Every structure is written in structure tokens, then in C-alpha cells.
Amino acid sequence: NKVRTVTEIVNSDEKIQKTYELAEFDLKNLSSLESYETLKIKLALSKYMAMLSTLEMTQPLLEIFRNKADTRQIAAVVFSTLAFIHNRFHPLVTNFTNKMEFVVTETNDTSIPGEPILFTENEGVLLCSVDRPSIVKMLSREFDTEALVNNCNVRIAKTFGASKRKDFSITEVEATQYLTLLLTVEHAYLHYYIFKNYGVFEYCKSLTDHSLFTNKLRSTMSTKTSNLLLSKFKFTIEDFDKINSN
Amino acid sequence: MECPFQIQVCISDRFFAFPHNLVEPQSDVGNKLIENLIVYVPTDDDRLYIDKKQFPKFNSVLVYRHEHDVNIDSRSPKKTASATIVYWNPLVPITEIGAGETRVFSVLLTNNLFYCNTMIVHHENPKCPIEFTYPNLRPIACEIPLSHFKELVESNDFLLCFNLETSTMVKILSLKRIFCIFQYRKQPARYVINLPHEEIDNLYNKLNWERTRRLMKGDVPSNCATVNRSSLKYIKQAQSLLGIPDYSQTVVDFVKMFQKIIFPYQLVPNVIIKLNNFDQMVKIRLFCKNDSIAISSSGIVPINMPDFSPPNTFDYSDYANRTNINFVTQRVLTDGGFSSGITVTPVKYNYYL
Amino acid sequence: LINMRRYRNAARKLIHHYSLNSTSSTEYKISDVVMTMIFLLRSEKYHSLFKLLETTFDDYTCRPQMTQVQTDTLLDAVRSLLEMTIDLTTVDIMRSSFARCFNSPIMRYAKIVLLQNVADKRTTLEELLIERGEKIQMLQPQQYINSGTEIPFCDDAEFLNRLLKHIDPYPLSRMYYNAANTMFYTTMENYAVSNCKFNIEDYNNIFKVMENIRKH
Amino acid sequence: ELINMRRYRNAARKLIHHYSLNSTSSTEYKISDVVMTMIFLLRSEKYHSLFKLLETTFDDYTCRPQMTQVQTDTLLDAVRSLLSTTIDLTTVDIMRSSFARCFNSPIMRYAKIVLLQNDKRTTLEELLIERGEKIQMLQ
Amino acid sequence: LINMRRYRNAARKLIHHYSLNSTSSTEYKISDVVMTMIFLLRSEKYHSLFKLLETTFDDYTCRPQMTQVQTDTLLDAVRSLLEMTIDLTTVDIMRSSFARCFNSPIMRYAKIVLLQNVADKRTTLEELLIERGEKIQMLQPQQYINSGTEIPFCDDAEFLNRLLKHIDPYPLSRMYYNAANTMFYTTMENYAVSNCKFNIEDYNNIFKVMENIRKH
């Protein structure tokens, strides 16, 4: 809210009182935090793009996922993303230990809605199932590069305080594609983490209801690991209450 | 652009060096020859290559750097009956004329002289130089080729340099003179132009237009052409893909390699197609002696017929239809187990199948 | 006469939204629906799609029957309109969405709904899990990597800085919105095609979990 | 023919008559009905003038274009022919406003995820540790 | 016959007042409105403006549609009448003002109103602040001065005295009135064009502040 300060000389009683409104410092703090988080997320995204480049695949991401024949590259990209997320949670880890299998489904009767990437052991080693058609559909869905997204007082204050500044094939569309892939693989990684550390039955229960994620993860994630990418924003379904009533 | 008939222009590669012998006094209305000669040159340094002693016909000889006189309209230049006026490789409009006919000698043929009525074109047997783009070269001050004349006629690896403030027209004239010297070289000479690629491309375009003007004036065709930078890059890529060392293979020979295919397979080599496309951005057709048909980028065409047959010549509806196209594409996708990157197109046909 | 170009633009935007082919969200109105239908009627190219949608004016709880040629023509028309790829599944999605819109009454407020009635038997998430998992276990790994390995991190800090500069003008808010809605719509399509109820509650529970982890 | 001109006439007459009669919620009609009516007006050259008027009504109301007496009489005659009870240009304008509002009415859409802007502060001890490490690193 | 000159003069004065192009304030009456309309009707030059205003007799809550040629003709006519510059915004302002006047009833007292219904969505000052500030921050400084510098005060006391003499006969009261009303009317126009409510309260609070500072 507000505070005030009083200046006074030791030998004198003439005191000068000033008042401060903390809203200004609140704006400073909020702007600093927003900038810091934006920088962190952009750094992570750039790092992801850079390692994918390091793999040195000729085609762009969407073309790669469209090329059904080259399962090799799909598996490479998926594993690299999964390992990147794993390290982002455990920076000291740079490999994945146990070897990994991969399969690329091609039909609805082979895919599971809501979990394009999933895991299942063959009783000896873990296999990652990929819904390449779903990946292609997501990355191909037309994106909005125009509309903006969003207290009016602090909004205006930020508008008037913060400033603005007026050879890569990447547009905002490709950045969005990369972010979507990262988020999907992050969701899959959370499922896999719950699996590995709580058993296949717990993994199935999580698939049924993600809410268990709360405890099964926050026990370790919020404390020791970098926050989830989604943590950058609070997400919600438009007209959620009426939709639920429906 | 208009020119006064009083000017007579002679174009010859030889004019890279001034033709002292060809100069002759002009006569006035009274048929009195003028013993005063005025020689105009594009740059001051050029004066040093004009030997006044080589003008016995005249009694006084003066040399000056021709400069655009903004106060005189070239459509009607001032006349000076007191002297015979000769211009050597002019780069700016002639604002002054001499008694009788004002003589001009040039290795270049710019628009200014292009409309000139009297045009004498000297013909030469072509002799091409070698483009040797590469980062033991002999530097050459292009602004003053005659100074390096001995080296230009002896050595075969030249680094063409220019002063920073050299003008574009000066550059063009220097390059033309050097290329004439190479045209008279018995042995083709390799050269490298120490200039930005875009500047070199513009210079080549202007030289090509000059050669076109000479042809339109009746010059003999010369195979000693030049290649735009994009075309050179494409040729280099092709050579690298084939595993051909660039220094080992010359572009001309590289292209000639496919003449064995041109006629016998009656097909236009893709290299020639790409070069033609580059030039267009800056169609093909050919035949053989006694040949009844012409090979073109479009395929076989009856000689003298348009590049495309009448639209209704062939009916493609049977397969040139969405149903057939989709059927074939789906069959390909299924058989190859593909999901993208597949594209099938109906095949159209020109005059002949 | 009519501004066929404006009609076409409105039709394209409405079709994109109703086919979930664009994360872009904007207001739509009966004016837009009329634009769309008039454009479809006027266009010789799209007569088949016009007929399809017009059939929605009836009970609309029916599966149109088309020859293979008809289906191919319709898909070609739609793909040419949206310039993409597509599927008869998207065709059915548009049919259902437009039928719901046409049957809906004129209202002072927009109606927010969920995709449904796409591709008869209602299946639960548990049944889908069992069946899909069995089929997956039947499937065999197309490819694999060995144990260990090493994540191929980039090294060129200059390259990283160049990429950072290249991405700076991208608003994280817009990118997040686009990605989240892409995933949500693809999940919606999968559920509707599978004829399995979409668990809005769990989908939102995902973000609930995100917040609960963040707060700690 | 794609258009069932008879059914289209029926729907167009229904809606046009309703809105000529009154202008309110009228919770017994459908976007399908509006589309039906507009398509009918387009197809019928006779009612092409009404079609153009309502096409104008799309977007802001704007203003009725100036029509001659003959044009206005023909318009009213065509309206009544589609409908009978007498009418006037005032009724035409009122119905035109009603249809403008209808066209401006929103339609169905699909929900979407919405980002909402989101507290905790660091401690001086950890701040000091990190910053002092940086200082030691400094030149 | 009619005194077309007097009619024109009354029309010009009324148009100036209703377009806020003159700080001058005076009484106006139905006689003046009739003067104006009769002049417009009689003048071949101004038939388009006559038609525009006559259309206000109807619902008048509508946007007239004109070709570019029509709009140019109307603007040329208005600009020739007022001898100025002008804008179709001023055209719309006059349309709205005259529509309000025509629709108003005959009253024993003048009606004092505020500009409104100029250029659909109601926007608040806060929303305008946010949007305009974002766009401004996007904009880049066209020019700038360096730090420090020095205000270039004049020095010629004789020059100052000459200027003082030149300005002595100017009534400060009239100048203040003109300036204040100029600013007020320009603010009114900006608000009306922006379709954002004018805060009469704050506009007067400006003078309240002036008085509160003066009293101390």
C-alpha cells in the first residue's frame, strides 16, 4: 500500500515527513520479474532450437514430421526433446541411461487422444509411442500472429514506463511450433516421470486423471527443478463453468 | 536522343590505342583544310598517350579532357570552324564540333553515339579472355591500361584494380580497352576484377548492352561473352557436385560438355537452360544444318513455328483431370509408404509427342 | 452484384474457425454466416460444399453419402479454399459445426460450445486406453537408440545470441496462446473422432497442477 | 438447381413478415432461417433491391440509399407480393434496422484457452551469496 | 425572391458554430436554421450538402454512404463555403449536430448539448490510454535535443516594448475566452471521434485545481 518516512536532527525537533506510495515499487518489481521470466523462456527456446540444429537435419521441423518415411529423424527429435526436458529438471543429467525404443503410430485406432506421446515398457525396456499424424496436425494448424493476449491502472503505468524498440527461416510461426512441441514433450515427460517413480499403475491413473501430478511432482519439481514452462502463465478454458455445466 | 549529322563515329577495338594515322584535317565551307587539331580524351592521363608528332598534316595540335558543358545542348553543339575536332573514347555528350565532319573513335558505343548517323564499325576475329574469379597475380591499374600494355600483352594472370573514386563510365571504358587487348592476345589471359559482385554484374550488363548496340550497328557476333555472378555460382555448384575442380574446368568447356547431348538426344542441357534463365532475369531454341525441327526448352518444334503448338492440338482430359491425378498420387503414396513430398503432374505435349 | 472477394474472405475465416484449422479467435456473426453461404452458392467451384452445408438445414443428425468422386471433389475444393493437410474428418467436423450453428437460434450473445457428433458408440477413456495399449504393445519399435548416449547441446554462444535476437520481437504471450490452443484443438479433434467424451475437467486440471507446482 | 426456390420463398416470407410485424427477441427463429431468407432474396431478381438493402444493413446500419418514387413504389409492391396487408417505407426502414441487428448478432463459437497475468520475493542472504560470487568473478 | 446574401451569411455562421470551427458564440434561432436550409437548397453549388442535411430528417442514426467523388465534392463545397483545413470528420460532426437540432422540438429556451455520435464501440479513457501509449512507445523519436542547452530568451528591451505596445489594445478577457474555448472544442472533437465519453467533471476539475492553487 503506502509508507512514510520522518527525517529529524538529533538536537532539533523540526521533523520533515514524506509519504511514499508503494505502487511504483510494485510496478518496478513486476516489470523486472516479467522481463526476467521472458528472458529465461526465450533462452530455453533458443537453446532447444540450437541443439536441434546441432543434430543437423536438412528439412525444417514441420517437413520432418510430415515425412512419414524417415522415422529415424522423428525418433531423434523426440528423444532429444525428452532428454532436454529431463536435464532442465535434473541439470546434472546429460544422458538417459537405459536405452529407449520408439514407435510411430499411424492410425486413430493406434493413437490415444490427449497423449500424443506416451510410454510403455516391453518388460525389459521403455518404448515411446508417437502420434506423428497428431504432431503434424498440431504444428500445421494455422497460428494467429496478429492478435494480442491478456488492473487497468498498472497496465497504463507499465505502458507509459516500459519502452519499446522498433538470416533465419524462423518466423513467429516456427517459434510457436517449437514451443508447442516442447510443451507436448514436457507433458509426456511428466507422465513418464510419474511412471518411472511410482509404477505403471500410478502411470495409468495419471493418464486417467492428471490431477495426481500435483503431489506426485510438486514433491520434487517445485523445490529442486526449474518451474514448468506453462508456469509462465495462468491458463484457463473460456466459459469453463458453463461448459462444465453442459 | 538526337545526334548532329556533322559527327562521324568509328567503332573499333583497335581504338583502345588512339588511331593517329586515321586523323585528317577537315575542310571548311571554302574547302580550306584546317591545320589546327583538337583531340578530346575522357581523362587527363589519356593526354600522355597522344603523340602530337604523329600529326604531320596539322600545324598545331592540342589535347583536352572532354567535359560535359552543361551550358550547351548536345542536340545542337557549338561549332568551331577554326579547328578539326576529334574525340577519342568519349564518355559524355559532345557539345563542340569542328570544321567539316567532327571525327570520333571509340571502343565503346554508348547511347550518345548510338544514334549518331555516320557509324563505321571495324570487325575483328573474336578472341576471348578467361574469367578467373579467385581470391601470383599481376595487378593492373585499369584506369591506365596502356601503361601496363607490355604486361597485358605478355603475362596471363591479371588482377584488375581501380582507384576508389574512379567513375563508372571510366571503369567501363577501361574494361572495354583491356578486353580489346585480350582480343588481340594470341593466348587467352586469366583475370580477376577486384570489385564487388554487384558492381561487376552491372558493368557486365552495360558491356552487353554496348555489344548489342554494336551488333545493331552491324558488328560481327563474338562468342567472347561474359557470365553473371549467379550463373557462375550455379556453374561452380554443378562442377563441385560432379567433382570437377573449379581451377581445372573452365565454364566454356563445362557448357560445351553437353553439346554431345544437345542434338543426339534432341534435348536442351539443363545448364544452358539455367544460364538462359539467369540472362532473362538480367526461352531457348536451336537447330542443326538442314534440320527439319528445332530443339527448344519446350521440346521439339517445327522450324519457324511458334514455341507452342495451337492450344487444341492435344486433348489431355483423359489423365489431365483431378480424378486421375488424385488416383495416381494416392497410389504412389500407398506404394511408397509416404505421407508428404509427393506431387504428380499431368504431362502436356508440344507439337510432337 | 456482390463483393465476391469480401464474401470469400469471410467464408475462409469462418471455415477456418469452424474446422479448428486456425488458432486465431475472433468475433463472428450472422452477417459472416450469410457471407459464407452466399459465396459458396455463387462459386461454381464450391457447389458441392454448398450442397453439403445446405443439407444441414434438415435434421442434420445424419451421415451424407457420397461417391468417391464426390468426396474427392469436395476435399479438393476445401483444400483449394484453405490452401493447405485436410481430411474428410475435417469435412465432417465442418458439417457438424455448421449444422449446430444453423440450428441454433438468433441470440443476443455468442454461443460457446465443444466439438461433438464427429465420426455412434460412446467410448470411455478407460476403454480407449485398454484397446489402444493392446494394439501398441502388439506394434513393434520402428527404431531405437542405445543406452546412455548424450544430449547434443549446442556450443556456439554467438549462434545462440543470433537466435535470441531473431526471436526477441516474438511475444511470448501470443506464442503461448497459439501453442496451448493448438494442443487443445487437436485433443478435441481426437476425442470427437474417437467418439469418447472429452474431460474438460482434467484438461483444466493440467493447468491447476501447473499452478499448484508453481505456488510451491 | 441447388436452391429450392419454393421453400426459400416460404422461409423468406416467414422472416420478412415477422420482422415487418414487430422487432424484438423473437426466440423462435434460426440462423438457418436468416440464411434461407437472404439466399431467397439473392436468387429472386424481383426482390434483388431488398437483397441489396439488407446487404447494406450488414455491418453498420448506414443509410437507406435514395430511391425514386417509382423505385419505392416497386419496392413496396414487391414486399406485399411476397406477403396483402399494406406497408410503408417507414415499415421497410424499421424492418431494415431489425435485420441489421440480426446480422450484427453474434453466432456460435468454440471455447479456447486464455492466458491470465499472474507475490514471492527472494531473501537478501541468497541474493548476497550470488552477487558476491559475481563480484569475486569481476575484474 | 430571397436575400441570398443574408441567407448565405446566416448559413455560414450557423455552420461554423455547429462544426466548432469558430470560438465565437452567439444566439441562434429557427429563423437561422431556415435561412441555412433555404440557402443550401437555392445554391446549385451546395446541393450535395443540402441533400446530406435533409437526410437527417429521418432516423438520422445512420452513416450516409457516398462515393469518393461525392465525398470530395461535399468537402470542396464545405471548404469553399467556410473558406479554409477541413475533414469528413467535420462533415460528420455537422451531420450529427444538424440531426440533433432538426429532431429537437420547438422550445422557449435554447438547448445546450455536447458533441456526440461522431465516428460504434464505446471506449473508456483507460483503454484509450493503454492502446495509445503502446502505439506511442512503438513509435520512435523523430528528433531530439541534447542535455542541458539554454532557453533562448530575447534581449532587446526596445523590441519587447514595441511588442507590448502592439499587444496593448488586445483584451486579455477575449483572448483567454477564445483560447480556452478552442482547447475545449478540440478536446470535444477528439473525444467524439474516439467514441470515448468526455469527462466534463475532470475538464472542470482543471479550473477547480487552478482556483485551489490560486487561493493558496
Contacts of D19 in chain C (CB under 8 A): none
Instruction: Compare all CA atoms of chain D with the CA of A155 and give the residue at the minimum distance.
Output: D117
Cβ–Cβ of A120/C141 closer than 8 Å?
no
What are the beta bridge partners of residue B191?
B131, B158
3-state secondary structure of D71: helix
DSSP designation for B206: H
For chains C and D, what is the number of CB pairs under 8 angstroms?
124
Out of A156, A163, A164, name the one closest to residue E129 (CB).
Answer: A156
DSSP designation for B143: T
Out of D63, D93, D97, name the one closest to residue E65 (CB).
Answer: D63
State how far the Cα of A24 lies from the Cα of A22, in Å rounded to an integer.
Answer: 5
Q: What is the Rg, in whole angstroms, of the alpha carbon atoms belonging to chain B?
A: 27
| C-alpha closest to that of B106 among B199, B27, B172, B201 | B172
Cβ–Cβ of D61/E58 closer than 8 Å?
no
State how far the Cα of D93 lies from the Cα of D63, in Å rounded to an integer.
Answer: 9
Contacts of B340 in chain A (CB under 8 A): 63, 66-68
The cell 514595441 sits on which residue?
Answer: E162
Which of D53, D63, D95, D101 to mutate: most E Cβ within 10 Å? D63
What order do you get walking across the sheet with B293-296 strand by strand? Answer: B285-286, B293-296, B299-302
Chain C, window 53-82: residues with a beta carbon less than 8 angstroms from a chain B beta carbon: 69, 72-73, 76
E: neighbours with 3+ CB pairs under 8 Å? A, D
State how far the Cα of D73 lies from the Cα of D71, in Å rounded to an integer.
Answer: 5
D57 Cα distance to chain centroid: 9
Angstrom distances, CA of residue C160 to CA of A41, A57, A68: 13, 18, 30
Chains B and A touch (3+ CB pairs under 8 A): yes
Contacts of D115 in chain A (CB under 8 A): 149-150, 233-235
Cβ–Cβ of C206/A172 closer than 8 Å?
no
Chains C and B touch (3+ CB pairs under 8 A): yes
CA dihedral B111, B112, B118, B120 (to 10 degrees): -60
Instruction: Compare all CA atoms of chain D with the CA of C105 and give the residue at the minimum distance.
Output: D30
State how far the Cα of E17 lies from the Cα of E112, in Å rounded to an integer.
Answer: 13
Cβ–Cβ of B326/C69 closer than 8 Å?
no
Say how many Å lie between the first and final Cα of chain A, rounded: 42
Angle in degrees, CA E130, E133, E134, rounded to 5:
85
Contacts of A153 in chain E (CB under 8 A): 126
Task: Report the b/e string of E46-61 with b at 16+ CB within 10 A.
Answer: bebbbbbbebbebbbe
| C-alpha closest to that of B218 among B95, B121, B332, B321 | B121
Angle in degrees, CA B187, B193, B195, rounded to 5:
175
| C-alpha closest to that of B227 among B255, B249, B248 | B255
Cβ–Cβ of C184/D42 closer than 8 Å?
no
Contacts of A150 in chain D (CB under 8 A): 115, 117
Chains E and C touch (3+ CB pairs under 8 A): no
Question: Cβ neighbours of residue D134 under 8 Å, at least 6 residues apart?
Answer: none
D116–chain C Cβ distance below 8 A for any pair: no
User: Grid coordinates representing C123?
Assistant: 467410448
Contacts of A66 in chain B (CB under 8 A): 339-341
Contacts of C97 in chain D (CB under 8 A): 108, 110
Angstrom distances, CA of residue D130 to CA of A176, B133, D136, E51: 33, 56, 10, 76
Cβ–Cβ of A166/E134 closer than 8 Å?
no
Cβ–Cβ of A233/D117 closer than 8 Å?
yes
D104–chain C Cβ distance below 8 A for any pair: yes
B335–chain A Cβ distance below 8 A for any pair: no
For chains A and B, what is the number of CB pairs under 8 angstroms?
18
Contacts of D61 in chain E (CB under 8 A): 61-63
User: Grid coordinates representing B86?
Assistant: 576529334
Contacts of A138 in chain D (CB under 8 A): none
Cβ–Cβ of A160/E127 closer than 8 Å?
no
Name the amino acid, one letter, at A152: C
* Stated resolution in angstroms: 4.1
A162–chain E Cβ distance below 8 A for any pair: yes
Q: Are C164 and A46 in contact (CB under 8 A)?
A: yes
Out of C166, C174, C210, name the one closest to residue A148 (CB).
Answer: C174
Chain D, window 73-102: residues with a beta carbon less than 8 angstroms from a chain C beta carbon: 102
Q: Are C37 and C53 in contact (CB under 8 A)?
A: yes
User: Grid coordinates representing A111?
Assistant: 493413437
A83–chain C Cβ distance below 8 A for any pair: yes
User: Grid coordinates representing A158?
Assistant: 507499465
State how far the Cα of C43 lies from the Cα of C94, in Å rounded to an integer.
Answer: 18
Out of D60, D64, D66, name the one closest to residue E120 (CB).
Answer: D60
Other CB atoms within a 10 A radius of the CB of residue E179 amount to: 11
Backbone angles phi, psi at C113, to 5 degrees: -135, -175
Contacts of D64 in chain E (CB under 8 A): 58, 62
D58–chain C Cβ distance below 8 A for any pair: yes
Out of A29, A150, A237, name the one closest to residue D113 (CB).
Answer: A237
Cβ–Cβ of E63/D60 closer than 8 Å?
yes
For chains A and E, what is the number of CB pairs under 8 angstroms?
25
State how far the Cα of A141 lies from the Cα of A131, in Å rounded to an integer.
Answer: 16
What DSSP assignment string belongs to chain A?
Answer: -EEEEEEE-SS---EEEEEEETHHHHHHHHHHHHHHHHHHHHHHHHHHHHHHHHH--SS-HHHHHH-SS-HHHHHHHHHHHHHHHHHHHSTT--S-SS-EEEEEE-SGGG--TT-SEEEEE-SSSEEEEEEHHHHHHHHHSBP-SS-----HHHHHHHHHHS------S--HHHHHHHHHHHHHHHHHHHHHHHHHHHHHHHHHHHHH-GGGHHHHHHTTHHHHSPPPGGGGSEEEETTHHHHHH-
Q: Are C155 and A127 in contact (CB under 8 A)?
A: no
State how far the Cα of B140 lies from the Cα of B155, in Å rounded to an integer.
Answer: 11
* Helix-helix angle C88-103:C172-194, to 10 degrees: 90
Contacts of A187 in chain C (CB under 8 A): 206
Angle in degrees, CA B195, B197, B203, rounded to 5:
75
State how far the Cα of C20 lies from the Cα of E32, in Å rounded to an integer.
Answer: 60
Q: Are B123 and B219 in contact (CB under 8 A)?
A: yes
| C-alpha closest to that of A113 among C187, C120, C19 | C187
3-state DSSP percent of chain E in helix, strand and coil, to 5: 60, 0, 40
Q: After which residues is chain D broken (C to N over 2.5 A)?
A: 83, 118
3-state secondary structure of C20: coil
User: Grid coordinates representing A51?
Assistant: 541443439
Q: Are A59 and A67 in contact (CB under 8 A)?
A: yes
Structure obtained using: cryo-EM
Give how far B339 is from chain C: nearest CA, Å.
10
E123 Cα distance to chain centroid: 21
State how far the Cα of C20 lies from the Cα of C203, in Å rounded to an integer.
Answer: 18
Give how far A209 is from chain D: nearest CA, Å.
19
State how far the Cα of D110 lies from the Cα of C17, in Å rounded to an integer.
Answer: 8
Chains E and D touch (3+ CB pairs under 8 A): yes
Question: Cβ neighbours of residue B310 under 8 Å, at least 6 residues apart?
Answer: none
| Helices and strands (H, E) in chain C, number of each type | 9, 2
Give how far A147 is from chain E: nearest CA, Å.
13
User: Grid coordinates representing B79?
Assistant: 561549332
Cβ–Cβ of D106/C29 closer than 8 Å?
yes
Question: Strands B78-79 and B84-88, how do they pair?
Answer: unpaired
User: Grid coordinates representing B82?
Assistant: 577554326
CA dihedral A89, A95, A101, A106 (to 10 degrees): 50
User: Grid coordinates representing E109?
Assistant: 429556451
Contacts of A237 in chain D (CB under 8 A): 111-114
For chains D and E, what is the number of CB pairs under 8 angstroms?
23
State how far the Cα of D36 lies from the Cα of D28, in Å rounded to an integer.
Answer: 15
State how far the Cα of D102 lies from the Cα of D30, in Å rounded to an integer.
Answer: 10
Give how far A13 is from chain C: nearest CA, Å.
48
Name the amino acid, one letter, at B154: E
Out of A46, A149, A233, name the one closest to residue C160 (CB).
Answer: A46
